[PDB]
Design a binder for this molecule. Sequence first.
Ligand SMILES: [Ca+2]
Ligand SMILES: [Ca+2]
Ligand SMILES: [Ca+2]
Ligand SMILES: [Ca+2]
Length: 243
Amino acid sequence: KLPKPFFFEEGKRAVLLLHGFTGNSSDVRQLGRFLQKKGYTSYAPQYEGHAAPPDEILKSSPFVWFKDALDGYDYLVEQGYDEIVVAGLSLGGDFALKLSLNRDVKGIVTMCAPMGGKTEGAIYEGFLEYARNFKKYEGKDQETIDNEMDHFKPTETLKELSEALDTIKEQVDEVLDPILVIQAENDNMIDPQSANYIYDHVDSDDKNIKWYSESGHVITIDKEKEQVFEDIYQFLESLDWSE
Ligand SMILES: [Ca+2]
Ligand SMILES: [Ca+2]
Ligand SMILES: [Ca+2]
Ligand SMILES: [Ca+2]
């Protein structure tokens, strides 16, 4: 079956977990379980059209996906959690930055968040591979997959994704809340220098950047995730929680 949002309720300190483009909640579930073991509540929404046939992404929009992130914050508040850190992977990291400008958070974690809307190359081919692997998961023959991929038109989606990323890059200088920037040194999906840009251009008074030398882009499921989780926990423990 396909992943669904998850909601692990423990103490009153809460973390909103935002996944990446073409990702879903399974990319942050292990982080959610780690946070739960450390006593933090977490909620991981899913963007419209994700965890679903890839055509549903083509019918959706980054503008909807950011409202899905905002809806996740508002859900935590409706469920009784007022103090919230937003932690985002890849596109979700950009959304975490932008969400902090739209909602009160105690802190921000960005994890391999791109700065800038270059979609040519790795992100384009990553989207196509995502669509091909889903069609295989649908049990489709190789001929139907090939035929269907010749009619898969990702251009408009990638253009909106590009414009959303560019807009957020120009909002980085408005970010004020405490921040942990996490980045894989050998990221083959985005430019790892994006992390230096975020770290240097946010206006936060409390910031930290951490580099990981043996992980790929999806750092929350790769081989150093235990250290990433520990570093996130140390950040969370440093923040201005009321309890
Ligand atoms: Ca409830
Ligand atoms: Ca600006
Ligand atoms: Ca300053
Ligand atoms: Ca700090």
